[PDB]
Design a protein around this ligand. Sequence first.
Ligand SMILES: OC[C@H]1O[C@@H](O)[C@H](O)[C@@H](O)[C@@H]1O
Ligand SMILES: OC[C@H]1O[C@@H](O)[C@H](O)[C@@H](O)[C@@H]1O
Ligand SMILES: [Ca+2]
Ligand SMILES: [Ca+2]
Ligand SMILES: [Mn+2]
Ligand SMILES: [Mn+2]
Lengths: 228, 228
Amino acid sequence: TETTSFLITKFSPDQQNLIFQGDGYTTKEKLTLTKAVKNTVGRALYSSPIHIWDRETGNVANFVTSFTFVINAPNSYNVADGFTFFIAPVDTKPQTGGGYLGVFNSAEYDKTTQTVAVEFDTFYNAAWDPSNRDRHIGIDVNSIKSVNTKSWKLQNGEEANVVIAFNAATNVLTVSLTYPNVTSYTLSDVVSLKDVVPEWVRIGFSATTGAEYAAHEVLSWSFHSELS
Amino acid sequence: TETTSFLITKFSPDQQNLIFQGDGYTTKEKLTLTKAVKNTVGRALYSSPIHIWDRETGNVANFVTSFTFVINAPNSYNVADGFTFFIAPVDTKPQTGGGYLGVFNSAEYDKTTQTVAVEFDTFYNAAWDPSNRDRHIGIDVNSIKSVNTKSWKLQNGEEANVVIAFNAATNVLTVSLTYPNVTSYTLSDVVSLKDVVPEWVRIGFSATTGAEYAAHEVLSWSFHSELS
Ligand SMILES: OC[C@H]1O[C@@H](O)[C@H](O)[C@@H](O)[C@@H]1O
Ligand SMILES: OC[C@H]1O[C@@H](O)[C@H](O)[C@@H](O)[C@@H]1O
Ligand SMILES: [Ca+2]
Ligand SMILES: [Ca+2]
Ligand SMILES: [Mn+2]
Ligand SMILES: [Mn+2]
């Protein structure tokens, strides 16, 4: 048995258990991924690698993470590009920015990326996003074109509580986003972790801007995993 | 609030959430610090830095750690040097070996060392060890000359269960050691953690051999800290 857990309900300016990439940094008790500026990327990784699956027994870890995040766009009508929670190899670095959200590089399935991300996409990219042009929650597996998505109305400036759980027995990854004014969205899909990501991974957040922009922030974060 | 927990009941050939130094490695499901050879040092740290106290609030964290260890001396009469569980600055590296247990450099107090350790000393070093020449458990603070100690009879090759707990309210550090055949030892003292170590630290194990030697292995390890 191997387990990993942490809880940070307030971020300090010298948060040494996180690995920052791009414009990502801590300030005023909040983790800032990107400011409201064009063409940036911000990423934050928890320092310790997680044992997501066991090569020897073939076991896969059960896990759940919770975080509260806020998106502040100066113009409630022009918002881009989004925020994501992602599971990737330990040595992971920012990928394509803008619509790619700093985690992927193509709309085509690329097994070499070995990355699963749960996106909060705020800008319609015609080449791969849902035709309805709605902002949405989506589950990505080695591609920026989600395997499943769910419309979501962004409440500019409001904090959203997100819970992402993965059940090892069913291979179901569930996502839930709740706003206080009480509006909730849920989305599920079967992800076969053991065949997408390496057995040791790093988890983090990622947010990007492009021609359109907004400030992406995390105010608290917990994670708990258990590999038997 | 900031909490960090982890539990490993079986070590893997590639235990990526641990940082090894000296001859420390994992094999046969155990963490091996030193083999039964002369003059070696082996350390293992948890990859993620821990927030042990906070300057702006003045708050210090409560923590507990449980581990099982084994010392195998080829000859129960000639055994050295010892094993330690320690808290030190994030960038910590192996220090002087032999009777300095890979954690300190002298028997004189040295503030820049910023290291608190709990030793399981199996060799009598005339210049600083307790005059009775007894194997002992000690609480070291910025010096290899323990602040407090307690005689301990080594049970060669046997599994020892240890619990080291720090109570932030009273600043009391307590250590307990138990052998199957049920022999127990306990020691405690008040350590002002906030005055000795930095805000962020890394925790781990250390073991060393010198002219006299023995194998030091850890069989399981859990840790939990909570800073309000
Ligand atoms: O910011 C909105 C959009 O800006 C464009 O300039 C980027 O090429 C595109 O990837 C992004 O989605
Ligand atoms: O191994 C037992 C002893 O061996 C000596 O050679 C080392 O100098 C000393 O530090 C150590 O305590
Ligand atoms: Ca998009
Ligand atoms: Ca000694
Ligand atoms: Mn999308
Ligand atoms: Mn001693």
